[PDB]
Amino acid sequence: MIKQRTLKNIIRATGVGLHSGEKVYLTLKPAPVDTGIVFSRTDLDPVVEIPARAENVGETTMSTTLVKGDVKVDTVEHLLSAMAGLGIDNAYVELSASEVPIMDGSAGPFVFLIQSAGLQEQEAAKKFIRIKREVSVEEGDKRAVFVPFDGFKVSFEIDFDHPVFRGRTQQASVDFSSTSFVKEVSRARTFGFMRDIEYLRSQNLALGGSVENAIVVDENRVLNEDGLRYEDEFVKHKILDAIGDLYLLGNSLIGEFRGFKSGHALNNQLLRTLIADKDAWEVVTFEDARTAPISYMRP
Ligand SMILES: C[C@@](CCN1Cc2cc(C#Cc3ccc(CN4CCOCC4)cc3)cn2C1=O)(C(=O)NO)S(C)(=O)=O
Ligand SMILES: [Zn+2]
Question: Which sites are catalytic?
């Protein structure tokens, strides 16, 4: 059978919150079967546990934030993207502060730390959410859609009227049958525009931000000196963001996501509509790895 996965070993990282600018210790630990991903604020008494689930999403301005009460865990999307892309079902994520560290602004540091520790298959059937019926949400020109698909595929289109964007670099489609999360998406860094970042800075937002954890784009160029990791890094990053947000379902998806200028807010509205639409999805398991439409790397 395809088995639930957790970590083989504890993983530890240090960094800074992109938005808060606070130093944060992150500790990933193994977790039992059917736990899901569960964030823990270890700086609080008592320690507050927030499942990484759609129902615990609060704020979706410039990040995906989980909330229990007024306890926040901010910027969960890049770490959850890493978790989803390596097929982790169960894990405790301990934070010493309200935000997940930004690291290099990608999921690469997280994928590397997790794969360093190794994955452990557990003696329970991995449960997948299969999309049975198309579900789409829209708000103005933004759109996000789940479509039935025998596999896991993510397509994303951005529309910036800007010298850096103008080309085929504005749409990408990744079929995880064909194409490695780790090699093609995981290293895609977050990005912002100089005028929007100056606005945020004026509001004492973006306190952890720099060219070391973000692609900074002005009116005409990428400001970062050392270049892009990918010709289409920007759209790849939005794909990374979508994978992380989608993982708030709590299970790997057998289905296709298509995003047009979608972000955390619309992704969350998509999850909420999917969840509500019980005819559009079913939970499945695979007795036999060989008949599954998804293959995950060896643990
Ligand atoms: C929502 C987004 C973007 C989210 N972002 C990307 C992002 C970058 C940023 C910044 C900054 C900054 C840069 C330079 C400086 C000058 N000094 C500062 C002091 O140290 C030396 C540099 C100060 C601040 C803030 N910021 C942010 O909110 C995402 O990826 N979600 O997961 S997306 C791509 O739109 O979907
Ligand atoms: Zn992001």
Answer: 264
Omega of the bond prior to 46 within 30 degrees of 0, cis?
A: yes
Residue nearest to atom 14 of ligand 1 (CA): 210
Distances (CA, A) of 37 to 148, 164, 226, 244: 25, 37, 35, 12
Q: Does domain 128-297 have CATH number 3.30.1700.10?
A: yes
Which SS3 state, helix, strand or coil, does residue 82 take?
helix
Pure H helices in the chain: 77-86, 108-117, 194-202, 233-246, 264-276
Q: Dig out the tokens for 203 from the structure.
A: 């509001």
Architecture of the CATH domain 1-127: 2-Layer Sandwich (3.30)
Q: How was this structure determined?
A: X-ray
Query: Around ion ligand 2, which residues have CB less than 5 A away?
Result: 190, 241
From the CA of 229, how far away is ligand 2's center (Å)? 15
Q: Report the catalytic residues.
A: 264
